[PDB]
Amino acid sequence: EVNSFSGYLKLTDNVYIKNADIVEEAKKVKPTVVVNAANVYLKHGGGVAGALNKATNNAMQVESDDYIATNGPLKVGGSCVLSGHNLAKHCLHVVGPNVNKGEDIQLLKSAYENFNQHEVLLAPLLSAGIFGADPIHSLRVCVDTVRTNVYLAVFDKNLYDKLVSSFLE
Ligand SMILES: CC(C)[C@H](Nc1ncnc2[nH]c(-c3cnc(N4CC(O)C4)nc3)cc12)c1ccc2c(c1)S(=O)(=O)CCC2
């Protein structure tokens, strides 16, 4: 079955959310697109990006280095489409702003706008965790910006509950 997402809560007509590890979701669902929470040089050193790269047994990092050699780094708010490897048909590498490193939070809208080139995506909550954005604000920008069908995997039950309660106010 194609894009067999299970156990998500529908927030709006095109945004769904689950308390889940994006890596485990990608292995089970094998979505058409999985979103990576990338940086501009596609160095998948830890967090979500490191976990997705490790699940490809480093094939994602080798492919990423070859893309950067030929094309140069991405811009903050930008993206590129590369292979999904064993996780998906394609991986959409999206660079959200890292507010802990001084990048502008307004670029989070540009980051989510990349999702609209793909009909169905499995994605993390951009710029959350160690990128420093307020995760409730990231969900609001997602809901207001994405018009295609997005399935958000948030690997923390405490944050999942706060996000759903924030949305349903
Ligand atoms: C908010 C937080 C709960 C969320 N975390 C996540 N959300 C969804 N799926 C996830 N899988 C993992 C994971 C991590 N490590 C291992 N590992 C196997 C072993 O080698 C370590 N496996 C899976 C974490 C994760 C989140 C969302 C966005 C961002 C971050 C974190 S970040 O990575 O801090 C910076 C980039 C933006």
Give 110-127 as a DSSP string: HHHHGGGGSSEEEE--TT
Coil, strand or helix: which one is 66?
helix
The best mutation among 18, 34, 155, 161 to test binding of ligand 1, ranked by most ligand atoms within 8 Å of the C-beta, falls on 155
Strand-pairing partners, residue 82, are 91
125 C-beta closer than 6 A to ligand 1: yes
Helix (H) or strand (E) segment spanning residue 39: none
Solved using: X-ray
Nearest CA to ligand 1 atom 1: 129
Tell me the C-alpha distance between 58 and 109, whole Å: 30
Q: Give the Cα separation of 91 and 123 in Å (integer).
A: 10
Q: Resolution of the coordinates in A? A: 1.2
Tokens 């069908």, residue located: 149
Residue with tokens 């996000």: 163
Q: How many Å is the Cα radius of gyration of the chain?
A: 15
Identify the CATH number of the domain defined by range 3-167. Answer: 3.40.220.10
Supply the residue whose CA is at minimum distance from atom 22 of ligand 1.
Answer: 51
